[PDB]
Amino acid sequence: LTFCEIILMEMESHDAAWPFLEPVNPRLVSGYRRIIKNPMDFSTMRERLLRGGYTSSEEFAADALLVFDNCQTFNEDDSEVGKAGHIMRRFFESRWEEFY
Numbered sequence: 001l002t003f004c005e006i007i008l009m010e011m012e013s014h015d016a017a018w019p020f021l022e023p024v025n026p027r028l029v030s031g032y033r034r035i036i037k038n039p040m041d042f043s044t045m046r047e048r049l050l051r052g053g054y055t056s057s058e059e060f061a062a063d064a065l066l067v068f069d070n071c072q073t074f075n076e077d078d079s080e081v082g083k084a085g086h087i088m089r090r091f092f093e094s095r096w097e098e099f100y
């Protein structure tokens with residue numbers, strides 16, 4: 001769980017992290033509520049991590065991947081949020097696998 005802190009810290013402070021720092025506001029984003037069944041973001045993962053809610057590295061990575069799955073589900077690959085999400089998804093997968 002120490003690497004979960006390191007990678008979440010580094011994801012939070014990443015340049016392309018801006019679309020995933022706080023939860024998507026469905027009032028502002030038209031169609032998000034309907035399309036994304038299980039929304040997830042870095043503050044929600046932060047909140048759960050500081051509360052000790054993650055039992056293992058697998059549960060953490062599950063929510064991490066859910067962010068980028070939702071991103072790709074809702075956003076086009078060439079959109080501004082999508083382009084950012086690919087940078088974060090690749091960053092996460094890369095860092096995650098050099099420690100595991």
Ligand SMILES: CC(=O)c1cccc(Oc2ncccn2)c1
Pocket residue numbers: 018019020021022023024025029070071074075081
């Ligand atoms: C993540 C995602 O799919 C999305 C979708 C639309 C807008 C958007 O912007 C935004 N959300 C939250 C915080 C800052 N920015 C993000």
